[PDB]
Amino acid sequence: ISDIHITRTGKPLIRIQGGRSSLGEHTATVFGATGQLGRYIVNRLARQGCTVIVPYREEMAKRHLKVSGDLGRVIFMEFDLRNTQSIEESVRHSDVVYNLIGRDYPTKNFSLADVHIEGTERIVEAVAKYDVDRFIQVSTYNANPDSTCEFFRTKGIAEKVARHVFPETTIVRPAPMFGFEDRLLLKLASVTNLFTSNHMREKFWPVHVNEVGEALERMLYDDSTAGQTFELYGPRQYSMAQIAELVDREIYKKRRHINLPKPILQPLAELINRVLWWDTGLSRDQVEREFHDQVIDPTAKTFKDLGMEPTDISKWTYHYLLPYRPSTYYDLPPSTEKEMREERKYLHVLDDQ
Amino acid sequence: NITLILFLIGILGFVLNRKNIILMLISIEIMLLSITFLILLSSLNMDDIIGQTYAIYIIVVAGAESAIGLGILVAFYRLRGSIAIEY
Amino acid sequence: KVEVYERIKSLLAGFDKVNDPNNITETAHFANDLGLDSLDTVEVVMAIEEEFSIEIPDKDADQIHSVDKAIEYILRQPDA
Amino acid sequence: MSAMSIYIIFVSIIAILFLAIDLIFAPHNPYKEQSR
Amino acid sequence: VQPTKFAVTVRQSRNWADAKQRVIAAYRAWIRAAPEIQTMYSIPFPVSHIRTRIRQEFERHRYVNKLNVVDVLLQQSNADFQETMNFWRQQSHVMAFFKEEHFRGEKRLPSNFITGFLEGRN
Amino acid sequence: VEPYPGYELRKSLRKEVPLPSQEGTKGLVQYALTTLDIITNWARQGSFWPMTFGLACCAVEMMHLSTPRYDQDRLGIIFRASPRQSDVMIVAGTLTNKMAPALRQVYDQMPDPRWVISMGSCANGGGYYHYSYSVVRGCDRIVPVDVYVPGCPPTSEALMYGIFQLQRKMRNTKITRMWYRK
Ligand SMILES: NC(=O)C1=CN([C@@H]2O[C@H](COP(=O)(O)OP(=O)(O)OC[C@H]3O[C@@H](n4cnc5c(N)ncnc54)[C@H](OP(=O)(O)O)[C@@H]3O)[C@@H](O)[C@H]2O)C=CC1
Ligand SMILES: *P(=O)(O)OCC(C)(C)[C@H](O)C(=O)NCCC(=O)NCCSC(=O)CCCCCCCCCCCCC
Ligand SMILES: CCCCCCCCCCCCO[C@@H]1O[C@H](CO)[C@@H](O[C@H]2O[C@H](CO)[C@@H](O)[C@H](O)[C@H]2O)[C@H](O)[C@H]1O
Ligand code: SF4
């Protein structure tokens, strides 16, 4: 909000606060920018005049991010989580570095250990190598170093290594995110054959990706957010079945719920993930994620500390599900007697054409 | 036995129809396809060509009722704007 | 006739620009009694209009300045 | 068997296969999104 | 409405009784239309917010005491009504009339002296 | 203090994978995925169907790419009307604020994979009408662009040159070899 920013290292920035052609003077490196969250942090910096370094793995995927900025603002770098030089040279000029990189499943090239540990290691070591001012690590909700979930385990261990080498790390633990192009509402919207093993009984606090994207901007703009952990989540407790009925109440969709017990589902989950090359939405570790419930850290800062209000998901379902609404002239209600009379003032056939 | 079942289907189209004057149009033709089909299968049994011919003339009268039936239904729709039966 | 008052009466109850509830009578005037403005009238009659699912013409809406006038127009309309 | 039977099944196989290349190899985005 | 669905031949108000009659009929049509504007343009606002915001745009010109000024302000309204009721305006033009869908939001002037000073004139 | 027991010794030995541009190719699995790419790229190149927005004069020069002297058909180019049948959008002409919503709508309807060519100064950066109240200063404020062709108007050879640059970009597109690295 101020026109002067003294970075944590000490250099001053004199920003002019406008739009695309302005001077935000922040240089940013967003790791994990081609997913669903990164396009909100990238667009927010770029549309206010800041340079955003966007490391990418695939050329095609990254293309939608350049529209948000003026010439010289979105710089694309070809990077690999196992090539340190690509990481090193992506962060040498950056003021703030973000790390949004994360999978929910193991691959043939990355175990949840490789992604969340060996990448955070490789990346934060570069942040410490160049004395970058702010380093913001997006972790997960329910992150805990000793967890049966490899996702909650390996993402919880990254939080350790982040501050072991960079003590001034912001941690951001977002709840399952929702909105446009998500895997929460769009999953309930799109899939038909759905497999679970805990009766869709997950309870959590769904948060809009858009406040998460806006919140990550404000951690850059407040120097007091440096070195503490945040818990971003929505205002109301929700269960997946309660979330689904909202999707159900808007779109009127019928889906198959199979709900196979945990012993016969998890060993099978690994197999499907090991032979199908796309994200099938169920894997071994993802099923274990079903049994936990979100527990809010009481020692961690929240939206309010950033001057923000979360919104619930009920106020947004109609917006993000309206495109998925098959409504033709067929599905309309039976007509009333008043309008049936109106039809007698028209001829409904053209007998001369 | 298939001929009788398919006759029932046309009958049952009249049993379950409170609103579709189009299904009443349809079931009459299912009933005609039963009777023509029965005539044909008995003609194969008796080595008679007259059963085949009688089927042909049933098919030609059946198409003509469709023209008269869809023509009259057009005349009705032009002044009504609905094929629905209030109930 | 009792219903056409009951549905209108509760409607003005939730209307904010009304100076104070309990001033609504059978003959309440929109300007003098309720203190509603020239553009607060149109807003009210629109609520009057939509609640009974009928479209008020301009030649008739300019006449709706008191509640009793509103009543006598809605009764004259066959649909409701 | 007769020749007419093997012929329809053959065409049926070819018609299915062109579906298979499409459904196997073509990308598949999940997002599939009143007057008289 | 001969050439187009909501066309109105350009007319010059004869006097203040006539000019106020037209203003009220213009306001009536707009606030009548607000449900129809909110579905076509998929406005993520209550119909009440649309109607209260339509009122503001008439509330701006409530103190005009010139009859030649009212007619141009009425013609502007009629033309805006025609391009909104025919689906000619894009959702982008319509929901850009609401001055809170800016990434800076409704708060775009500085509130007082000091807050605009610390931000460099906003 | 230690973050996890394996640290301070595991970091000593780690592998270094060259970036995809400098990546080599070796192995049966690697060749096989590479062949799948080359065939896929051969057909994305051989059949090159552009959807087009002839906004102004540059469209005339795109019409001279279909005439006998320079024929597109001989290289496999067939301009399709529908976005659903198309591969690449060629924005050829001055983009105005009134035209921009329909540009984004048409691009939003292009099935993947998608490429955009910006043809001419007007689409590239506004051109002669850059300092106007009615013109979008560059079509890349609306959609992503892959090739920019210069000139007002580019010659027909120049637009051909731009298509060959794009055809080369596709020949260098790794589809099944990127999925293999991750
Ligand atoms: N969205 C949610 O519901 C929640 C998500 N989070 C976490 O927030 C972060 C961002 O979320 P979201 O946008 O949904 O994540 P996505 O899965 O949509 O995107 C993750 C990003 O990480 C990159 N990435 C993943 N694995 C690797 C790898 N091995 N090497 C290099 N890059 C990699 C991806 O690039 P590419 O596309 O090329 O793989 C992509 O840009 C993630 O860490 C996520 O787990 C936390 C809690 C809830
Ligand atoms: P009451 O007697 O208190 O007040 C009645 C009036 C207002 C007539 C006054 O008595 C009066 O004389 N005032 C001066 C005359 C006047 O109001 N002039 C202007 C009338 S035209 C006008 O105001 C047009 C406003 C804009 C029209 C469009 C509004 C909606 C556009 C956006 C909709 C939402 C997005 C699609
Ligand atoms: C009729 C004969 C028997 C059937 C033969 C054909 C089988 C077809 C199914 C196997 C191939 C599936 O094809 C593949 O589907 C998946 C899921 O929809 C898509 O996957 C895509 O959407 C899913 C949605 O969950 C994402 O998580 C995934 O990351 C993305 O790539 C692939 O883009 C598509 O290429
Ligand atoms: S770039 Fe030149 S030729 Fe092309 S549309 Fe603009 S003015 Fe016309």
CSV table of C-alpha atoms in Angstrom, one decimal, chain A:
chain,number,residue,atom,x,y,z
A,1,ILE,CA,0.0,0.0,0.0
A,2,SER,CA,3.0,2.2,0.7
A,3,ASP,CA,5.1,3.6,-2.2
A,4,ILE,CA,8.4,2.6,-0.5
A,5,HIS,CA,9.5,-0.9,0.4
A,6,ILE,CA,12.7,-1.6,2.2
A,7,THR,CA,13.4,-5.3,1.5
A,8,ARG,CA,14.5,-7.6,4.3
A,9,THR,CA,18.1,-7.3,3.0
A,10,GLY,CA,17.9,-3.5,3.1
A,11,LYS,CA,17.5,-2.2,-0.5
A,12,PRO,CA,14.7,0.3,-1.1
A,13,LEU,CA,12.0,0.0,-3.8
A,14,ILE,CA,10.2,3.1,-5.1
A,15,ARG,CA,7.0,1.8,-6.6
A,16,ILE,CA,4.4,3.6,-8.7
A,17,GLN,CA,1.1,2.0,-7.9
A,18,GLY,CA,-1.0,1.5,-11.0
A,19,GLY,CA,-1.8,-1.3,-13.4
A,20,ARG,CA,0.0,-3.1,-16.2
A,21,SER,CA,2.4,-0.4,-17.4
A,22,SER,CA,3.1,0.7,-13.7
A,23,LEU,CA,6.2,-0.1,-11.5
A,24,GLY,CA,5.6,-2.6,-8.8
A,25,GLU,CA,9.4,-3.1,-8.6
A,26,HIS,CA,9.0,-6.5,-6.9
A,27,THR,CA,10.8,-9.3,-8.6
A,28,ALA,CA,9.1,-12.7,-8.0
A,29,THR,CA,9.9,-16.3,-8.6
A,30,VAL,CA,6.9,-18.6,-8.4
A,31,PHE,CA,7.8,-22.3,-8.3
A,32,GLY,CA,4.7,-24.3,-9.2
A,33,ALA,CA,3.0,-21.6,-11.2
A,34,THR,CA,1.3,-23.8,-13.8
A,35,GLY,CA,-1.2,-25.4,-11.5
A,36,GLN,CA,-4.5,-24.0,-10.3
A,37,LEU,CA,-3.2,-21.8,-7.5
A,38,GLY,CA,-0.1,-20.3,-9.2
A,39,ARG,CA,-2.1,-18.5,-11.9
A,40,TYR,CA,-3.7,-16.4,-9.2
A,41,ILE,CA,-0.4,-15.4,-7.5
A,42,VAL,CA,1.2,-14.7,-10.9
A,43,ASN,CA,-1.7,-12.7,-12.2
A,44,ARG,CA,-1.9,-10.6,-9.1
A,45,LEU,CA,1.8,-9.5,-9.2
A,46,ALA,CA,2.0,-9.1,-13.0
A,47,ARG,CA,-1.2,-7.0,-13.4
A,48,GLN,CA,0.3,-4.5,-10.9
A,49,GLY,CA,3.6,-4.0,-12.7
A,50,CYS,CA,6.0,-6.6,-11.1
A,51,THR,CA,8.4,-9.0,-12.7
A,52,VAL,CA,7.4,-12.6,-12.2
A,53,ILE,CA,9.9,-15.4,-13.0
A,54,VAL,CA,7.8,-18.4,-13.9
A,55,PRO,CA,9.9,-21.6,-14.0
A,56,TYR,CA,8.1,-24.3,-16.1
A,57,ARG,CA,8.5,-27.9,-17.1
A,58,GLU,CA,6.1,-28.0,-20.2
A,59,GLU,CA,6.0,-25.3,-22.9
A,60,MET,CA,2.4,-25.6,-23.8
A,61,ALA,CA,1.1,-25.4,-20.2
A,62,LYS,CA,2.7,-22.1,-19.3
A,63,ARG,CA,1.2,-20.0,-22.1
A,64,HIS,CA,-1.9,-18.7,-20.4
A,65,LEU,CA,0.3,-16.9,-17.8
A,66,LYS,CA,1.9,-14.4,-20.1
A,67,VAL,CA,-1.3,-12.6,-21.0
A,68,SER,CA,-1.5,-11.1,-17.5
A,69,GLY,CA,1.6,-8.9,-17.9
A,70,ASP,CA,3.2,-6.2,-20.1
A,71,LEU,CA,6.4,-6.7,-22.1
A,72,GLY,CA,9.4,-7.8,-19.9
A,73,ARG,CA,7.2,-8.8,-16.9
A,74,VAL,CA,6.5,-12.5,-17.2
A,75,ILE,CA,9.8,-14.2,-17.8
A,76,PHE,CA,9.7,-18.0,-18.5
A,77,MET,CA,12.5,-20.3,-17.4
A,78,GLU,CA,12.8,-24.0,-18.4
A,79,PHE,CA,13.5,-25.9,-15.1
A,80,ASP,CA,13.6,-29.4,-13.6
A,81,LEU,CA,13.2,-30.2,-9.8
A,82,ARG,CA,16.4,-32.3,-10.2
A,83,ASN,CA,18.5,-29.7,-12.1
A,84,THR,CA,19.9,-27.2,-9.5
A,85,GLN,CA,21.4,-24.8,-12.0
A,86,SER,CA,17.9,-24.1,-13.4
A,87,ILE,CA,16.7,-23.5,-9.8
A,88,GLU,CA,19.7,-21.4,-9.0
A,89,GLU,CA,19.4,-19.0,-11.9
A,90,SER,CA,15.7,-18.7,-11.4
A,91,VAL,CA,16.1,-17.1,-8.0
A,92,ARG,CA,19.3,-15.0,-8.2
A,93,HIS,CA,17.4,-11.8,-8.9
A,94,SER,CA,14.2,-12.4,-6.9
A,95,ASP,CA,13.1,-10.4,-3.9
A,96,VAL,CA,10.5,-12.9,-2.9
A,97,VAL,CA,10.5,-16.6,-3.9
A,98,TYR,CA,7.3,-18.7,-3.7
A,99,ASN,CA,7.2,-22.5,-3.7
A,100,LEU,CA,3.8,-23.9,-4.7
A,101,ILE,CA,5.2,-27.1,-6.2
A,102,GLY,CA,3.4,-30.2,-5.0
A,103,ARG,CA,1.6,-33.4,-6.1
A,104,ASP,CA,-1.0,-35.5,-4.3
A,105,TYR,CA,0.3,-38.8,-5.8
A,106,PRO,CA,3.5,-40.6,-6.4
A,107,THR,CA,4.8,-40.8,-10.0
A,108,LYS,CA,7.3,-43.0,-11.8
A,109,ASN,CA,9.8,-40.2,-11.3
A,110,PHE,CA,8.8,-38.6,-7.9
A,111,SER,CA,7.7,-40.0,-4.6
A,112,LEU,CA,5.9,-37.6,-2.3
A,113,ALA,CA,9.3,-37.7,-0.6
A,114,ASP,CA,11.1,-36.5,-3.7
A,115,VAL,CA,8.7,-33.7,-4.5
A,116,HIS,CA,8.0,-32.1,-1.1
A,117,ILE,CA,11.5,-32.8,0.5
A,118,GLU,CA,14.1,-33.1,-2.3
A,119,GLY,CA,12.6,-30.2,-4.1
A,120,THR,CA,12.1,-27.9,-1.1
A,121,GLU,CA,15.7,-28.8,-0.1
A,122,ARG,CA,17.0,-28.1,-3.6
A,123,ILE,CA,15.0,-24.8,-3.8
A,124,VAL,CA,15.4,-23.3,-0.3
A,125,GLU,CA,19.2,-24.0,-0.6
A,126,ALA,CA,19.2,-21.6,-3.5
A,127,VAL,CA,17.1,-19.0,-1.5
A,128,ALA,CA,19.8,-19.2,1.1
A,129,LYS,CA,22.5,-19.2,-1.5
A,130,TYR,CA,21.6,-15.7,-2.7
A,131,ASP,CA,20.2,-14.1,0.5
A,132,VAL,CA,16.7,-13.8,-1.0
A,133,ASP,CA,14.5,-11.5,1.2
A,134,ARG,CA,11.2,-13.3,1.6
A,135,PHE,CA,10.7,-17.0,1.0
A,136,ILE,CA,7.1,-18.2,1.2
A,137,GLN,CA,6.5,-22.0,1.4
A,138,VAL,CA,3.0,-23.1,0.7
A,139,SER,CA,2.5,-26.3,2.7
A,140,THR,CA,-0.7,-28.1,3.3
A,141,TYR,CA,-3.4,-28.2,5.9
A,142,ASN,CA,-2.9,-31.1,8.3
A,143,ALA,CA,0.8,-31.0,7.7
A,144,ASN,CA,2.6,-32.8,10.5
A,145,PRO,CA,6.0,-34.4,10.5
A,146,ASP,CA,4.7,-37.6,12.1
A,147,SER,CA,1.6,-38.6,10.1
A,148,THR,CA,0.4,-41.8,8.5
A,149,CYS,CA,-0.3,-39.7,5.4
A,150,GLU,CA,2.7,-39.4,3.2
A,151,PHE,CA,1.2,-36.2,1.9
A,152,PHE,CA,0.8,-34.8,5.5
A,153,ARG,CA,4.1,-36.4,6.4
A,154,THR,CA,6.4,-35.3,3.6
A,155,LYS,CA,4.8,-31.9,3.3
A,156,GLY,CA,5.2,-31.5,7.1
A,157,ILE,CA,8.9,-32.4,6.9
A,158,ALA,CA,9.4,-29.8,4.2
A,159,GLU,CA,8.2,-27.1,6.7
A,160,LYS,CA,11.1,-28.3,8.9
A,161,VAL,CA,13.8,-28.1,6.3
A,162,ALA,CA,12.4,-24.7,5.1
A,163,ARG,CA,13.2,-23.0,8.4
A,164,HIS,CA,16.2,-25.1,9.3
A,165,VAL,CA,18.1,-23.4,6.6
A,166,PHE,CA,15.9,-20.3,6.1
A,167,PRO,CA,14.5,-19.3,9.5
A,168,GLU,CA,12.5,-16.4,8.0
A,169,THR,CA,10.2,-18.6,5.9
A,170,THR,CA,6.5,-17.8,5.8
A,171,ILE,CA,4.5,-21.1,5.9
A,172,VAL,CA,1.1,-21.1,4.3
A,173,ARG,CA,-1.2,-24.1,5.1
A,174,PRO,CA,-4.3,-23.7,2.9
A,175,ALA,CA,-7.5,-25.9,3.4
A,176,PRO,CA,-8.7,-27.9,0.3
A,177,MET,CA,-9.1,-25.0,-2.2
A,178,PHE,CA,-12.2,-24.4,-4.3
A,179,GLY,CA,-13.3,-22.4,-7.3
A,180,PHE,CA,-12.7,-22.2,-11.0
A,181,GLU,CA,-10.6,-25.1,-12.4
A,182,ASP,CA,-10.2,-26.8,-9.0
A,183,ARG,CA,-10.2,-30.5,-8.0
A,184,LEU,CA,-12.8,-30.0,-5.3
A,185,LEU,CA,-16.1,-28.7,-6.8
A,186,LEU,CA,-15.1,-29.8,-10.3
A,187,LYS,CA,-14.5,-33.3,-9.1
A,188,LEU,CA,-18.0,-33.5,-7.6
A,189,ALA,CA,-19.3,-31.8,-10.7
A,190,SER,CA,-17.5,-33.9,-13.3
A,191,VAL,CA,-16.9,-37.4,-12.2
A,192,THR,CA,-19.5,-40.1,-12.4
A,193,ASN,CA,-17.9,-43.3,-11.1
A,194,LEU,CA,-16.6,-42.3,-7.7
A,195,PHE,CA,-14.6,-44.5,-5.3
A,196,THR,CA,-14.2,-43.9,-1.6
A,197,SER,CA,-13.6,-45.9,1.6
A,198,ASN,CA,-14.9,-43.4,4.3
A,199,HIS,CA,-18.4,-42.7,3.1
A,200,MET,CA,-17.4,-39.2,1.9
A,201,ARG,CA,-17.2,-38.3,5.6
A,202,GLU,CA,-14.2,-36.0,5.4
A,203,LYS,CA,-14.7,-32.8,7.4
A,204,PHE,CA,-12.8,-29.6,6.6
A,205,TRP,CA,-13.0,-25.9,6.0
A,206,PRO,CA,-13.1,-25.2,2.3
A,207,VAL,CA,-11.4,-22.0,1.2
A,208,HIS,CA,-11.6,-20.1,-2.1
A,209,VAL,CA,-8.5,-20.2,-4.2
A,210,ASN,CA,-9.0,-16.5,-4.9
A,211,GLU,CA,-8.6,-15.4,-1.3
A,212,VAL,CA,-5.6,-17.8,-1.1
A,213,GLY,CA,-4.2,-16.0,-4.2
A,214,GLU,CA,-4.9,-12.7,-2.7
A,215,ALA,CA,-3.5,-13.7,0.7
A,216,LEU,CA,-0.2,-14.8,-0.8
A,217,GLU,CA,0.1,-11.3,-2.2
A,218,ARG,CA,-0.3,-9.7,1.2
A,219,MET,CA,2.3,-11.9,2.8
A,220,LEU,CA,4.7,-10.2,0.4
A,221,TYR,CA,3.4,-6.7,1.3
A,222,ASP,CA,3.6,-7.1,5.1
A,223,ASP,CA,7.1,-7.5,6.4
A,224,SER,CA,5.5,-8.8,9.7
A,225,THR,CA,4.3,-12.0,8.0
A,226,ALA,CA,7.9,-13.0,7.6
A,227,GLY,CA,8.8,-16.0,9.8
A,228,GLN,CA,5.4,-17.2,10.9
A,229,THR,CA,2.9,-19.8,9.8
A,230,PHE,CA,-0.6,-19.1,8.5
A,231,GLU,CA,-3.7,-21.3,8.4
A,232,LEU,CA,-6.0,-20.2,5.6
A,233,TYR,CA,-9.4,-21.8,5.7
A,234,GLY,CA,-13.1,-20.8,5.2
A,235,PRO,CA,-15.7,-19.8,7.7
A,236,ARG,CA,-17.8,-23.0,8.0
A,237,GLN,CA,-17.1,-26.6,8.8
A,238,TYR,CA,-18.1,-28.9,5.9
A,239,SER,CA,-18.2,-32.5,5.1
A,240,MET,CA,-17.6,-33.9,1.6
A,241,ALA,CA,-21.1,-35.3,1.5
A,242,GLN,CA,-22.4,-31.9,2.6
A,243,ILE,CA,-20.3,-30.3,-0.1
A,244,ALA,CA,-21.5,-32.7,-2.7
A,245,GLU,CA,-25.2,-32.1,-2.0
A,246,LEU,CA,-24.5,-28.4,-2.8
A,247,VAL,CA,-23.0,-29.5,-6.1
A,248,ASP,CA,-26.1,-31.7,-6.4
A,249,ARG,CA,-28.5,-28.9,-5.4
A,250,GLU,CA,-27.2,-26.7,-8.2
A,251,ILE,CA,-26.6,-29.0,-11.2
A,252,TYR,CA,-29.0,-31.9,-10.7
A,253,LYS,CA,-26.4,-34.6,-11.5
A,254,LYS,CA,-26.5,-38.4,-10.7
A,255,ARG,CA,-23.2,-40.0,-9.8
A,256,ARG,CA,-22.2,-43.5,-8.8
A,257,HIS,CA,-20.8,-43.8,-5.3
A,258,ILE,CA,-19.0,-47.1,-4.7
A,259,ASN,CA,-17.5,-46.7,-1.3
A,260,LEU,CA,-15.4,-49.9,-1.2
A,261,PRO,CA,-13.9,-50.7,2.3
A,262,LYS,CA,-10.3,-49.6,3.0
A,263,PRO,CA,-8.6,-53.1,2.9
A,264,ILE,CA,-9.9,-53.9,-0.6
A,265,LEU,CA,-9.5,-50.2,-1.9
A,266,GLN,CA,-6.0,-49.1,-1.0
A,267,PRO,CA,-4.0,-52.1,-2.4
A,268,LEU,CA,-6.1,-51.6,-5.5
A,269,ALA,CA,-5.5,-47.8,-5.5
A,270,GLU,CA,-1.7,-48.2,-5.9
A,271,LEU,CA,-2.2,-50.5,-8.9
A,272,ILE,CA,-4.4,-48.0,-10.8
A,273,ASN,CA,-2.0,-45.2,-10.1
A,274,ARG,CA,1.0,-47.4,-11.2
A,275,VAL,CA,-0.4,-48.2,-14.6
A,276,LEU,CA,-2.6,-45.2,-15.6
A,277,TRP,CA,-0.6,-42.3,-16.8
A,278,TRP,CA,-3.1,-39.5,-15.8
A,279,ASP,CA,-4.2,-38.3,-12.5
A,280,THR,CA,-7.0,-40.8,-11.8
A,281,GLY,CA,-8.0,-39.0,-8.6
A,282,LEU,CA,-7.6,-42.1,-6.5
A,283,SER,CA,-4.2,-43.4,-5.4
A,284,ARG,CA,-2.9,-45.2,-2.3
A,285,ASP,CA,-2.0,-42.1,-0.3
A,286,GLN,CA,-5.0,-40.2,-1.5
A,287,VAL,CA,-7.4,-42.8,0.1
A,288,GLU,CA,-5.6,-42.5,3.4
A,289,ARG,CA,-6.2,-38.8,3.1
A,290,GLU,CA,-9.9,-39.6,3.3
A,291,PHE,CA,-9.8,-40.8,6.9
A,292,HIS,CA,-8.2,-37.7,8.4
A,293,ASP,CA,-10.1,-34.6,9.3
A,294,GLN,CA,-8.6,-31.1,9.1
A,295,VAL,CA,-7.4,-29.9,12.5
A,296,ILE,CA,-6.8,-26.1,12.7
A,297,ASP,CA,-3.5,-25.1,14.2
A,298,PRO,CA,-4.3,-22.7,17.1
A,299,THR,CA,-0.8,-21.1,17.2
A,300,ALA,CA,-0.9,-20.2,13.5
A,301,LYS,CA,-2.1,-16.9,12.0
A,302,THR,CA,-5.3,-16.8,9.9
A,303,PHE,CA,-7.0,-14.6,7.3
A,304,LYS,CA,-8.0,-12.0,9.9
A,305,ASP,CA,-4.3,-11.3,10.6
A,306,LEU,CA,-4.0,-10.3,7.0
A,307,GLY,CA,-7.1,-8.0,7.0
A,308,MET,CA,-9.1,-10.5,5.0
A,309,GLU,CA,-12.4,-12.3,5.3
A,310,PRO,CA,-12.7,-15.8,4.0
A,311,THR,CA,-15.9,-16.7,2.1
A,312,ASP,CA,-17.8,-19.9,2.3
A,313,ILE,CA,-18.3,-22.3,-0.6
A,314,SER,CA,-22.1,-22.0,-0.5
A,315,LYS,CA,-22.1,-18.5,-1.8
A,316,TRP,CA,-20.1,-19.5,-4.8
A,317,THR,CA,-21.5,-22.8,-6.0
A,318,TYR,CA,-24.0,-21.3,-8.4
A,319,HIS,CA,-21.3,-19.2,-10.0
A,320,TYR,CA,-18.7,-22.0,-10.5
A,321,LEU,CA,-21.3,-24.6,-11.5
A,322,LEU,CA,-23.5,-22.5,-13.8
A,323,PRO,CA,-21.5,-23.6,-16.9
A,324,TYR,CA,-22.4,-27.2,-16.0
A,325,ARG,CA,-26.2,-26.8,-16.2
A,326,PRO,CA,-28.0,-28.6,-19.0
A,327,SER,CA,-31.1,-26.5,-19.5
A,328,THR,CA,-33.0,-26.8,-22.8
A,329,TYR,CA,-36.6,-26.1,-23.7
A,330,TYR,CA,-37.4,-29.7,-22.7
A,331,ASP,CA,-36.6,-29.5,-19.0
A,332,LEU,CA,-38.9,-26.5,-18.5
A,333,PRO,CA,-41.9,-26.8,-16.1
A,334,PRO,CA,-45.5,-27.8,-17.3
A,335,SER,CA,-47.3,-24.6,-18.6
A,336,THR,CA,-50.0,-22.7,-16.7
A,337,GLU,CA,-53.6,-22.0,-18.0
A,338,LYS,CA,-52.9,-18.3,-18.3
A,339,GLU,CA,-50.0,-18.8,-20.8
A,340,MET,CA,-51.9,-21.6,-22.6
A,341,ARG,CA,-54.5,-18.9,-23.5
A,342,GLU,CA,-51.7,-16.6,-24.7
A,343,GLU,CA,-50.8,-19.3,-27.3
A,344,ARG,CA,-54.2,-18.9,-28.9
A,345,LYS,CA,-53.3,-15.4,-30.1
A,346,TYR,CA,-50.5,-16.9,-32.3
A,347,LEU,CA,-50.4,-19.1,-35.3
A,348,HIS,CA,-47.8,-21.8,-34.6
A,349,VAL,CA,-47.5,-23.0,-38.2
A,350,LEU,CA,-46.6,-21.1,-41.4
A,351,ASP,CA,-49.0,-22.5,-44.0
A,352,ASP,CA,-47.7,-20.4,-46.9
A,353,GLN,CA,-44.0,-21.2,-46.4
